[PDB]
Curated annotation (Swiss-Prot):
There is a cross-link at K66 (Glycyl lysine isopeptide (Lys-Gly) (interchain with G-Cter in ubiquitin)). The chain holds residues 243 to 526 of 595 of the full protein. This is Tyrosine-protein phosphatase non-receptor type 6. Monomer. Interacts with MTUS1. Interacts with MILR1 (tyrosine-phosphorylated). Interacts with KIT. Interacts with SIRPA/PTPNS1. Interacts with LILRB1 and LILRB2. Interacts with LILRB4. Interacts with FCRL2 and FCRL4. Interacts with FCRL3 and FCRL6 (tyrosine phosphorylated form). Interacts with CD84. Interacts with CD300LF. Interacts with CDK2. Interacts with KIR2DL1; the interaction is enhanced by ARRB2. Interacts (via SH2 1 domain) with ROS1; the interaction is direct and promotes ROS1 dephosphorylation. Interacts with EGFR; inhibits EGFR-dependent activation of MAPK/ERK. Tyrosine phosphatase enzyme that plays important roles in controlling immune signaling pathways and fundamental physiological processes such as hematopoiesis. Dephosphorylates and negatively regulate several receptor tyrosine kinases (RTKs) such as EGFR, PDGFR and FGFR, thereby modulating their signaling activities. Belongs to the protein-tyrosine phosphatase family. Non-receptor class 2 subfamily.
Amino acid sequence: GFWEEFESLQKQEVKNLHQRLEGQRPENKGKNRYKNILPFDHSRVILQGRDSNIPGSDYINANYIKNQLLGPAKTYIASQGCLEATVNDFWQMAWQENSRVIVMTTREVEKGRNKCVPYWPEVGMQRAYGPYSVTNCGEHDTTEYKLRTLQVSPLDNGDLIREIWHYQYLSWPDHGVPSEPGGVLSFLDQINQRQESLPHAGPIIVHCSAGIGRTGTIIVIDMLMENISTKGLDCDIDIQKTIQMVRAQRSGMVQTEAQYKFIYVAIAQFIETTKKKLEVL
């Protein structure tokens, strides 16, 4: 009963075993959307090329996330959405990690709170973000999501160009989840095809506003789709264990009851549609 459940939750808890000193530093307060949603130090992304004499200079609110139920599948970075003060930091992260696919699970403003400052130029335009140039080479929309094709280079070396594929989900409800999972499944299918075409690509960057709710939901669904793709349709799927495994890497991943239930709904539909496709004729 109660005490057994409590002891189970306690044992499962690992927030007390992993510090978050860097994110709590007063020097980094303007770099966090929420003072209590912070990266673990052990798994945080450390920005390169920064001066250690500038307090906090290496900090971004983002963590590496791997499917650690597996023997050391794609890897991820779970990140918060940019603030004005952190747009350049975000590009430094994308460049240094060799990320070629970015998954943004929010609109910039969702009536009417700022969820992410934009970090791309408009179509056909080129902008500087710190030591990088970013060009928007085109936008292609579906009803639920947008693909923005970016080209990024160091400011000084325009000959060195990386294509980065920016997938933005547009129809995720504010303070809820999609009413059906088909849009997210289609989105993740496109993202997966792109990443698999780029075998040397770095981790996929996934972000929302705080980088734990929609971000954790998307990463967990994608991890389970990867397990099913690789291990097969009747492989063991343990959603609760997968969620705990991701929460050990960034606290609070999959934040709401609606998100938790949506993972089940999405994976159920993925399995059922996959089976139906196999059984045709």
